[PDB]
């Protein structure tokens, strides 16, 4: 049949971060600091025990997808703290 292109539901835009929410998380990421395993990872991501670092996140978080997201999360911290300090 003669199929239409439908617009997108306004609910499928859940999961997209705004510019105001990303500014909320960035502030609270530092003002809350780092958890008593995420201090451990930041050391191992600083002196490049990379295979050892990824081993701990998988064991603690449970899944590589999270265990890769932290890497991407925490490595942005050190590369921004070398310009602050």
């Amino acid at each position: 049949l003669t199929k239409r292109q439908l617009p997108e539901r306004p609910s499928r835009r859940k999961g997209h971060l705004s510019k105001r929410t990303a500014f909320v998380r960035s502030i609270v990421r530092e003002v809350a600091g780092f958890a008593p395993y995420e201090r451990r990872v930041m050391e191992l991501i600083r002196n490049s025990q990379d295979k050892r670092a990824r081993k701990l996140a998988k064991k603690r978080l449970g899944t590589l997808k999270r265990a890769k997201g932290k890497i991407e999360e925490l490595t942005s911290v050190i590369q921004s703290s070398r310009l602050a300090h």
Partner: protein
């Protein structure tokens, strides 16, 4: 017990954050009062105030 890692809030952001435009109800008499005045004004015609 390390120091304070202010890696993000070190600098200053120059822009505002929310981008939705300034509404028109901040540049005119407070329309909530204008409704409130008419409740008092009506009350004078009924003679309760």
């Amino acid at each position: 017990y390390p120091d304070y890692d202010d890696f993000f809030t070190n600098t200053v952001r120059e822009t505002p954050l929310s981008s939705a435009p300034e509404p028109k109800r901040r540049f005119a008499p407070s329309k909530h009062e204008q409704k409130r005045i008419l409740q008092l004004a009506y009350a004078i015609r009924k003679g309760r105030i």
